[PDB]
Each structure stands twice: as C-alpha cells, then as structure tokens.
Design a protein around this ligand. Structure first.
Ligand SMILES: COc1cc2nc(-c3cc(F)ccc3O)nc(N[C@@H]3CNC[C@H]3C(C)(C)O)c2cc1OC
Ligand SMILES: COc1cc2nc(-c3cc(F)ccc3O)nc(N[C@@H]3CNC[C@H]3C(C)(C)O)c2cc1OC
Ligand SMILES: [Mg+2]
Ligand SMILES: [Mg+2]
Lengths: 286, 286
C-alpha cells in the first residue's frame, strides 16, 4: 500500500512510466488538479536531489511540490502531460528543425541556469527532457537530478607550498573547473539526435568501438539525412561535440550561435511562457 | 574560557604548539594522566576527521580519546611527548640512516593501513608525524586527518551505455583509482628529507620553478650529502618520487624493498610495541 501521509493528500492513479524509479499520475485532493509522483524505492542521491530541486527556480526546470520519506521515496511534482522527448525521436522519428530549435533553446537556458547556480546535471538525455503538453510547440523541462553534482579541495591545496605535493595534482590544475562541459557534450548528442533521428555514436553497422567513436569524436555522418538539415544547425552540433572540454562550446557560446539568433522562435517561447503563467499571475502595481 | 564540559574532565595546561589548530597539554582528572587536546577554532572537516579517527586502530596512527563541540572544537588525544618529526630535520639536521629506517617503516605500515581501509591522508609531512617519546628510538604516529578523503560515481557511470557520455570521462578511466599514490609521493619527499636533511624540491639557489621541479620530477641531488647515505635507501626514494602515479611504488612495494628487509630494525619496532603495550595488557587464556 501507499503511505498514509501520501494517501491523505493525494489520490494515486495510473503509472505513467517505469522504471530503473517509477512515475504515477496523481490528484491533489485540495485542488483536484493533476500532479506527477515519482516513486524511488529504498538515499543520499535523494536528499541531494530534493535540496537541489527545492532551491531551483526556472521555467525549463522541473519543480517539486511535495516529498514523502517512507518505505520508499515519494516525490510530488508538476505533471508534464507531454511525456518524454525520447518518444518524439525514437525509431528515426525526427522533429522539424524549427521544433528542434525551440526545444534546444529551452534546454540551453535550463542548463545555463544550472551552471550559473553551480550545478552539473550529468545525465542529460531525451528521457530526462519532458514536454509540458501534447502540442508540438510547448514548454520543455529538464528532470532527474539524481546524478547531479554541486560545483574545492584543489583550491585549498594550492594555497600552500607544494613541497610535499604530488605531480599529478599540479597537472590537474590545467583542466580543473571544466566538469560542467560534460553537460554541453550531452546537449550536443541530444541535438544531433533531434535533428537527424539517429545517434551520433553507436554500435550499429560499424566495427569501431563505442568508446573509440566517442574519444576520437568521429560521429556517424550520413549526408542524405543531414542534407535536409540547415548548415547553421549542423555547425552548432559540431561545436558541442568537441573532444577537448576546454575548447567545447559552453551554453553561452551556444546561445550566441547564429542558429539561435531567431526572433520567431524566441517569440514563440515567450508566448508559451506568459501562456503557462496566466493562471497564477497575481495583480501588480502599474 | 574553556567549555564547562571540558573543564569538568580535564585540567588544561601549556600550549605545545600553534597553529593554523592549536595543541595543549592537559591532564585527565579521573586518571591524572597527561593527554593532548587539539583546539580547532570554529566543521565538516572535523566530523569527517572525528569519524575517521574513531574507526581507525593501528599502533602508528594517533588515537582519539574524547571530543567536545563548543564555541570551538576540542579533540582529546593520546599525548605524543616526543613532538614533531619536523624538529628532528629542521636546519639540515639529519637522522642516522637507521633511525630513518625505523621511522619510515612505521609510516609505511600506517599509510598501508589507511589505504587498506579506503582512506587517503593527503597531507603527509614531517609536522604530521609525531614521536612518542624523546628517545631517538621510539614509536611514531601519523596525525592530522583534516584533509583526508574516503575512497564511485565513475563506476556507476560505466554501468550504462555511453551514448551521451563525454570523452573526458572515458579518458579518466585509465587513471581512476590511483588517488592514494599522492600519499606515496609525500612519503618519498619525507624520506628524502629525513635521509639528507634538505628538501628534494625548493626555490633555494635555482631558477627552475617549484612547480616545474615537481612535475618533471627532477629532484635536487647533492652527491656530497648523499654519499654518506646507502644506495638501497636512495633507490627507494627514487621509486617513490616517480612522476607517473601508476608506475609509482605503492606502500606494499616499498615494504618489500631491500632497504626495509632489515630484521634488526624490525625487532626494535616489535620491542617498542610490546613495551608501549605492557601497561594495558590484560591477562589471557594460555
Ligand atoms: C504523459 O506520459 C508520460 C509522462 C511522464 N512524466 C514524468 C514526470 C517526471 C518528473 F520528474 C516530473 C513531472 C513528470 O510528468 N516522467 C516520465 N518518465 C521518466 C522521466 N525520466 C525517465 C523516465 C522514468 C524511467 C523515470 O520513468 C513520464 C513518461 C510518460 O510516458 C512514457
Ligand atoms: C612535545 O612537544 C610538542 C608536542 C605536540 N603534540 C601534538 C599532538 C597532536 C595530536 F593530534 C595527538 C597527540 C599529540 O601529542 N601535536 C603537536 N603539533 C602539531 C602537529 N601537526 C602540526 C602541529 C600544529 C600546527 C597543529 O601545532 C606538538 C608540537 C610540540 O612542539 C612543537
Ligand atoms: Mg526528478
Ligand atoms: Mg589530529
């Protein structure tokens, strides 16, 4: 059975998805509104995630409504009726380039916001991008902060004299503080897949190991599929899939890239925004 | 003033040392015995250190007796009347090679024990090696676990498919799990200094940066001083001061090194051991 404290406030309903975590539809008794409830079976992963989720406040980042610590973990969140981005791209399905742009722009904003706030997601992928409605033009939100990391001991070590300090520590100074680039790489992969309908790196019809494809950065380019796609878009992908994390495009550089200087897309986003907001906008001093 | 709960059990006495932390002599009321009390001015560093200290049990590792969380932190420990190894090597003072060996052997045991127990010290140096008495032949103990680290997310990342995984993460797999080598490097530096009376790497009478001396591994070799020293000893130093952490000697390899196959030194250690133990040895089934 469900915990009594949960049952007190919510009527549990259908399973929306499972599950490595399960997500169920629920109704908040007080409002009769739909919510999502994530059930994580029984720890530190979760308190981190909760505390991270509580502190974050961005339109393209999932918001937590309630939390229950019981025989299992129960996280109550705003419902994303549109489901996973995964479903929109599975089986070589592919979005209009312009839909890619609208989605990708939001992802970039979300991840930029995470980075400004010292948080690295570390598990960005189509299954962790949720759509807010069943419309093709909607708001997206990043979810699943279980692998996240809060961005040191290196700095403290550097404050003193290295008399006893190991060489590898001094060598790590060259690259320290670029952990956030892993998110930009993932975003690069996600965008590749959204644009093209297929994975840049995979074991499909190739003898190169997955590992070797990735560390060499030799993605699978299929001209016939990409010919349909603009060159501005493909150019952005190529700057995200840079092997050297110090050279890789950051979220800011990506947001300043020509493919995203598109005022039509940006208007549509601001629209969906104010649209979502209307129901909760309190009056204000003019 | 000192906390009432501390004062209740101990009479505070002279400052033994300060302090970046301060250490005072104290007397336990109940036994009238001398203890040391470390005063760390006001956090996570400390709970870690305490919990680490509570769990460890080795003759060459400092033992905690009591702890007080107040306006400041108060750690009560067994008193080391011999003071810091630092004092024995400052101003080009140098120990008989045989004293070096006895000391170094204990350090190796201590650090080997830490590594077996998933703990990396990360701040080994002569000021964190304490002597148990004023005798030249005594027991040594490692102290100061404030920078320690408990030895992953890499493993968890490797369990899945790297479809979205960044190149630098896959590249880090080659060297993952060798963090403990930093302790062996430090031990190498400490042994160099003990044997020779001077630092392997420093800004003294040289134009090479300290950083460059370390990452290149070009220690300062002065034949006149080292001529006095055996070649077995210098050979061990050279295997500890290896730049590549994967090639660097571990504690086990160091303990198996010819310089430490010395049954006379080992007897003297077992003696000091049973000697320390005599006062607390309970009777036992024959
Ligand atoms: C509409 O249909 C669906 C709605 C969904 N809503 C949320 C959802 C998750 C939140 F954290 C917050 C609000 C939400 O709506 N999460 C789903 N699934 C997750 C997302 N990460 C992977 C996956 C897994 C394995 C955990 O089940 C949904 C899957 C659906 O169909 C498969
Ligand atoms: C006998 O004279 C001395 C005894 C000492 N005993 C302990 C001591 C520390 C413990 F953690 C446990 C038992 C002990 O005895 N620690 C000292 N000093 C520390 C060691 N790390 C650096 C240094 C500093 C900066 C913290 O003061 C002593 C310094 C002395 O003279 C300078
Ligand atoms: Mg979540
Ligand atoms: Mg200590």
């Amino acid at each position: 059975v469900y915990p009594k404290a949960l049952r007190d406030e919510y009527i549990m309903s259908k399973t929306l998805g499972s599950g490595a975590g399960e997500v169920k539809l629920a109704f908040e008794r007080k409002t009769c509104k739909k919510v999502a409830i994530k059930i994580i079976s029984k720890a530190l992963n979760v308190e981190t995630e909760i505390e991270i989720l509580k502190k974050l406040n961005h339109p393209c980042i999932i918001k937590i409504k309630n939390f229950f610590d019981a025989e299992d973990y129960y996280i109550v969140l705003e419902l994303m009726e549109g489901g996973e981005l995964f479903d929109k791209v599975v089986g070589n399905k592919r979005l209009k380039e312009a839909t890619c742009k609208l989605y990708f722009y939001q992802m970039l904003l979300a991840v930029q916001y995470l980075h400004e706030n010292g948080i690295i997601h570390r598990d960005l992928k189509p299954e962790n991008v949720l759509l807010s409605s069943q419309e093709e033009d909607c708001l997206i939100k990043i979810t699943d902060f279980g692998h996240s990391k809060i961005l040191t001991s290196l700095m403290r070590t550097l404050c003193g004299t290295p008399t006893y300090l190991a060489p590898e520590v001094l060598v790590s100074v060259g690259t320290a503080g670029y952990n956030r680039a892993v998110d930009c790489w993932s975003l690069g992969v996600i965008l590749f897949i959204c644009l093209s309908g297929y994975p840049p790196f995979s074991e499909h019809r190739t003898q190169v190991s997955l590992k070797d494809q990735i560390t060499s950065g030799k993605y699978n380019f299929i001209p016939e599929v990409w010919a349909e796609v603009s060159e501005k878009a493909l150019d952005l992908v190529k700057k995200l899939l840079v092997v050297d994390p110090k050279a890789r495009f950051t979220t800011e550089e990506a947001l300043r890239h020509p493919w995203l200087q598109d005022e039509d897309m940006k208007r549509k986003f601001q629209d969906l925004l104010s649209e979502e907001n209307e129901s909760t906008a309190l009056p204000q001093v003019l």
